[PDB]
Each structure stands twice: as C-alpha cells, then as structure tokens.
C-alpha cells in the first residue's frame, strides 16, 4: 500500500538579507512514494505577548510479538492571526522567500508530499523558526 | 455475575455490551481489533483474576471512560509474566482508571500508545510489587506529553519526587500508614486485613470490594474451610462443586481434581489421581507411569532478628562461584547509630569472624539488643585460601530491642 510521506528531514533555514529568507531541508526519511513536491508555509508571528507594555529603560520477545501477529493474520488490511504566505516546492529541499518584515519572526511550516498525496493527502509538517535580517 | 470461563472480545463495541451484567471475570480478558462508529462505562466490573490484554482498540480516549471501578487484577496467571498488556492504543490519552487499587502478581508492559499521557504520573509501587519488571516503550514521549497532576499527592518516584495522577481530575488514590500494608476506604478509613483494595466500609470483611487471600459467602478469608478447597487462586469451592466440574473438553478431559487443598484442572507433575480417575491426586513414588578464581561475593545475604541479643541470617550462592563453594566465612561489625542526630536534645568496634559449614544460614548471639550491626560475609572457594577470599556481600541488620 502507498502511504503518507514522512515529514521533511533536517529542516534548516537562514536569512541572507533583510526582507528575505532562505530555507533548506532534507528529503523525508520514508517517501513511501515519489515525492511530487514539498509545500512550505510561513506566517508573520506577533512579537511575544506582554513585553510591549513594560518600560525596560536470553530474550524471547519475538515469539511474544508473533502472538499479536497471529491474531492479525486472521484479518486482512487493504487500502482501496497574521496571514500566511504560501508556496509549493517544485524540486529542491530549498526555496527563497522575500519582502518579509525586517527583524520580524516568522513561522515556517514544511510538508513533504508524494505522488499519492493527491489521493492520500500530503505529509504532516516538519518545521523550524528563523528571523529575518533587520532593515539595514 | 461470575462471567467466564474466558472472554475474547473483538471487532465491535456493540459486542462489548456482554459486560453489562459482569462484575467478576473468571479467566483472561482479550480485547482485539475494535473500531468504533461512543462513550462506554462498565463500573460493574471490579476484579479480574489473571491478566488483561487490549490490542488496537480504536475509539477510546481514556480508560476512565470504560472501567473506572476496576479495582484489582490478581494476575494469578500471567501473559509471559505480564499481568497487563496495552498495545498500539492509538488515541488513548490517559489512564483514568482511578479506583485501581492493586495489581497483585505480574509485571506491566506498555507499548506503542503514541498518544498516552499520564505515563509516569502513577506510582506503580503502590499498586503492584516488582515494578522493576515493567516494560514501557514507544508511548507518547513524556518530555513532550508534558504530564500534569492537580495540586494531590507525591512520592519519591525513582530519583525524583513528583505528584502522582491517573488523569488531570483523578490521582492515584492511596492509604495512610495507619492502614499501610492494609487497604483503605476513600476517607483513609482502614479496610479489613482480609480485604483487598477499596472498601465500601472500613475494617469489615463483609464490606470488601476484594479479598487479598480468598472470598467465601461474602467473607474474605485466609484459607478454605475444611469441606472447601482452593479454586483458581481466589475463592473456595466445595467437594461437590468440582464434582460438577468436568474440565475443558479435550483428549485429556477429566473432572477437576483436589490436591494440597486446591481444586485444579489436573494433578501437578509427580502426582496422579487416586484409583479410577478419582477426585483427589496422590503422589507417585518414583516416576509416574505414562583454574579457580576469586569468588563473587555471596548473593542475597539477608538477615533479621526474632529476639533481643540474637540474629537470624540467610543468603544465596554467589553470582560467580568460580569454583566449588567449600564454605562461607561470616564477619560482623557494629555500626554506630547515625552520625549527627545524637547532638540535639529534641525534648573501633571489633569484627567477629566465623566459618560456615554448609547452609546459607547461620545464627549469631550475645548481641546488644537494638544495636545496629554490620555483617560482613566473605565467600571463599577451595583456592581462596591461596587466592584470597571473596569480597563481601553485606547487609546491615538490627537485633530485636530490649523492652
């Protein structure tokens, strides 16, 4: 049976420029199928709550497990508030995002699909946080 | 109802309704392959002898939904020495089994419950004995489950001390040292000593939820009355009851048999039925017809006192005998009563040495009553008299106090 890809591996990100971000990741541990594409999402995160207001100035277990397998072998299993910007990934586990708010924090979500995500759905996200370079 | 002689529940929760009238289950419970298309509650169930097994029960979020009052599992027989197994319970988030007061025999194994929280929020040492045998793997990562207890109560959980909870709304309920080894009712009212787990009234063997030893006619009892005999390991039945018991249908199927005061499906090995397959077993006399190195320290050296000025002591053969065991040589030393302590007003010791003949047991005499003693036992193989004797296996024990 086909399945949901693994989450992306080794999700890693940086900013090389103010208002710009670079992100790199690695292909999923188990594609379980041809990858189709990755989808990366990002959203402005608010700067942390409060903060603003305050003035800061021997073993045998395999024969055990077989017991659970033996009951299974009696039955088959047979498959038939700020806005997000978003972009799909065509190829690389790398993409670049621009016109970001300088020095703001963003969430980045990365999902890894496969050829069956049009039917199975795409994988859950592997995700990381990074900050853009401030507006020099 | 005494349900039985064995329960196998699979596929559908609509089949789970068999429990509506059950309160005791004779024999194991298996729960397999259930998938749902609801809440369920079975507070009538209170004690299971033997073990409970659940496997791939989709659609249950917490165990306190089904079996809140399930108070004792005896584990008289074990699944590979396990009395409870929970496997691949996708979606189970907590153990709200908050009346669970004892698991008598058996270890616990807990695998693949990837959403289970309240993992180590339960003091297993309160409810069951050799917790060191448990196996808890692949469940929701506690570092990321981030369990929580209200407040309730806490204990020295391994290297920690931490609050103990079944679920956010229910803790692992416990009894004070006024009951201690003995059970209690909710309000810390001590149960009857023949009782087990929670009680509907304190100190009454006729008001028990369960019995530690045996049950009969609404009475918790230590052993079967003379015309009553041990059955399974929890209740007594009369000579005629087992006389009604044809064993399980089998090529070797016969009536149950009574022996050593237990009524059992068949005689223990080395014993046979009297005469024409009689109700009682009898033993068969004979087979029934168809270089050195330094020894380890001794093992399991243990000792106690039954009298002032005396001690009794027992041990086990060493981990590595490294030879034929010859004998044991026992030493003992006075410890001081603990340092500091003495100075506040709250209102050089000799070794003895002696050499054992044969037993892992010996007696020591003329001690000061209530003084603490170190016993050092050195274990010397036939070449230890050249090699040097073993390091010690050791214990500290106290003489019974002088009144």
Author numbering:
A (entry chain A): 577 to 633, 682 to 704, 744 to 799
B (entry chain B): 1 to 37, 41 to 154, 162 to 300, 577 to 633, 744 to 799
Provide the authors' own sentences about this structure as they appear in the paper.
Despite these advances, there is currently no three-dimensional (3D) structure of IGF-II bound to IGF-1R or to IR-A. To begin to address this shortcoming, we present here single-particle cryo-EM structures of IGF-II bound to the intact ectodomain of IGF-1R.
By contrast, the density of the (L1′-CR′) + αCT module is relatively well defined within the open-leg map, with the αCT helix being visible in an apo-like conformation on the surface of domain L1′ and with protrusions in the map being identifiable with the aromatic residues Tyr688 and Phe692. Nevertheless, the existence of the open-leg conformation for the IGF-II-bound ectodomain is unanticipated, as such a “wide” open-leg conformation has not been detected previously in the cryo-EM studies of insulin-bound holo-IR, insulin-bound zipper IR ectodomain, or IGF-I-bound holoIGF-1R. One possibility is that the leg conformation of structure is an artifact of the zipper attachment, which might limit the mobility of the IDα and IDα′ segments and lead—upon ligand binding—to their entrapment between domain L1′ and the respective domains FnIII-2 and FnIII-2′.
